[PDB]
Amino acid sequence: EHAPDKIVLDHAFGQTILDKKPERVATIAWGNHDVALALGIVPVGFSKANYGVSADKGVLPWTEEKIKELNGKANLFDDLDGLNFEAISNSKPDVILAGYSGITKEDYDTLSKIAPVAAYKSKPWQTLWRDMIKIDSKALGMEKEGDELIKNTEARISKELEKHPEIKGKIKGKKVLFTMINAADTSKFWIYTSKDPRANYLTDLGLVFPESLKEFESEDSFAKEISAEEANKINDADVIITYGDDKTLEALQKDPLLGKINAIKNGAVAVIPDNTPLAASCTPTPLSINYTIEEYLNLLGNACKNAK
């Protein structure tokens, strides 16, 4: 008989309407569970991770830590291969958090037969970390707590910067590009745009994007593939970030085309050790940030020392 007030979510597939204070929270895709956990809520189910951790564990250190602290269990969807609708349904969720995600219209329609879905605003994988919090927390009926979580996460970042005066000054205003450069094939590579949370996080640390990036912001993607032939377009970058290994930088500087790029020949390159918790953290969540920001700043400060 009682009709509690509704939460109405605007997103890429229209609207989601649910009753205030949903109890059982499922999440899907990268990082959304870290929002629930940061807000003190243990999901009845969330997506398995296999980047920066083994599929066997399927959970990152900061996530595992927060769960244990909340005296909870980790209920993982066996969904590395794709959404596991059966597993999601069996968790009997009152809501499904997908604020940062790549779901299609068909995914959305099917998930919605299980529970109300908090989808991304516009485009797949184009949700910045603050907006992930805004979307997911509003779905929980916890907008206010979400804003407070954003403010505390911003404070965490600011605190760590203040503790490293040299690094803070050294990276401030450096023009940076987050990329994916495969040393085993340099004919083409990827540049993440400002719409990608991992590129955008860098601006939270005081870095900026070079003007060259704007050429690639027009396409509706979180990343653009460009040929080595175009590599000279980004000679205005002070520093470049890429995933890789201890062989990556050497290989790049020796490359006939990539080796002529200013930041690369300068050694102004932060190589994130691939498939590590640190690599995972570069797509930030409120939990990952606290856990890794010191290590990340040191890596960034060190690459920026080489900028000329």
Numbering used by the authors: 34 to 341
What do the authors say?
To obtain sufficient iron, S. pneumoniae evolved two major highly conserved iron ABC transporters, which are termed Piu (for pneumococcal iron uptake) and Pia (for pneumococcal iron acquisition) systems, respectively. Pia system is responsible for the transport of hydroxamate siderophores such as ferrichrome and ferrioxamin B, whereas Piu system for the transport of heme from hemoglobin. The overall structure of PiaA is composed of an individual N-terminal and a C-terminal domain linked by an α-helix. The N- and C-terminal domains face each other to form a hydrophobic and plastic cleft.
A crystal from 2.4 M sodium malonate and 0.1 M Bis-tris propane (B3P), pH 7.0 was applied to soaking with 300 mM KI and eventually enabled us to solve the structure (termed PiaA-B3P) at 2.0 Å using the phases obtained from a SAD experiment at the iodine edge. In the structure of PiaA-B3P, a molecule of B3P with two conformations binds to a cleft of PiaA. Superposition of apo-PiaA and PiaA-B3P against the ferrichrome-complexed form gives an RMSD of 0.31 Å for 262 Cα atoms and 0.45 Å for 283 Cα atoms, respectively.
